């Protein structure tokens, strides 16, 4: 899960998830 190149802190104003019925990359 941990990776030094990635900051594990979500923006409170953005839901950090995706709808499985929709391709996340549009």
């Amino acid at each position, epitope marked *: 899960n941990a990776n030094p*190149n990635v900051d594990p802190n979500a923006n409170p104003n953005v839901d950090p998830n995706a709808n499985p019925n929709v391709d996340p990359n549009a």
Partner: antibody
Amino acid sequence: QVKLVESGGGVVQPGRSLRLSCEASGFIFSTYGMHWVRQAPGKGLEWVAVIWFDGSNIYYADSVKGRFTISRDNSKNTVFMQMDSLRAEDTAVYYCHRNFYDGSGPFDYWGQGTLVTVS
Amino acid sequence: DIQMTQSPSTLSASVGDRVTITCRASQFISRWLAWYQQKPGKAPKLLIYKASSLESGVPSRFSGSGSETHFTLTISSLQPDDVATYYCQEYTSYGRTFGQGTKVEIK
């Protein structure tokens, strides 16, 4: 606007040293870390070394261990690479790279690279 | 000491075709595989953030998949503008490991 600007190349006769640098611009190097990526002409990319901010994490590729040293000028926001006892195999373009990922998307930042010839 | 390998070192396909580039690692990448596109003479650009995650600004034609030690980059509707050497990057720690690079040309 974020840029990484490399300088300090040239022709180094075998056995001589070279000191390369990458000037940070548009950001303060106070977060993740800086990488040197080497590419001999006609060859693929080779990561050479990383200096993590404040020097807590220093790593090198096996091919340069004991020959290359990296450090930062903490006043000029500039990353330096000390290359000692250079050999012919070290001919390459040395690129400054600053990759990290942080919530909103990826960041990479590549410079243009400094050409170092060792013949 | 993690080796990165791109088996299809050279590929070629006509314009509009589909190019499949595989990538393997001797140790787990665990989806932290970045894909880069290097046009000769230029610094490489990041295409794929991580396994199956395309970077914004990178054409939707690019896609990929993988996990563990086995990954693939797919180039749909291949264009002349895609002739580049593509590279695998492992970013699981404080430093990066690169693959050999695969050259994709046009038939």
